[PDB]
């Protein structure tokens, strides 16, 4: 599948490339409903 593993620093553009969104609020579960 591949030949090598590359390790380097993470540019902010690369970090936004990994991301599928931006987290904005610090709450996880409604805890009354168990929904995210």
């Amino acid at each position: 599948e591949f030949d090598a593993i590359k390790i380097a620093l993470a540019s902010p553009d690369m970090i936004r490339s990994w991301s599928f969104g931006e987290v904005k609020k610090p709450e996880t579960i409604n805890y009354r409903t168990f929904k995210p």
Partner: protein, 50 residues
């Protein structure tokens, strides 16, 4: 703040660490109330206390 924690947003009792309704749900409730109020001719609650 964050020592005592902000109390429940839609109620009385400032400065409490309770796990009540969040900010996202509160804005939803407020806009739903705005729609249901502006819709059909519906007088104010406290006004009909008159």
């Amino acid at each position: 703040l964050e020592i005592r924690g902000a109390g429940e947003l839609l109620g009385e009792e400032q400065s409490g660490s309770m796990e009540t309704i969040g900010f996202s749900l509160y804005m939803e409730l407020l806009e739903n109330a705005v729609d249901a109020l502006k819709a059909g001719r519906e007088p104010s609650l406290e006004d009909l206390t008159s």
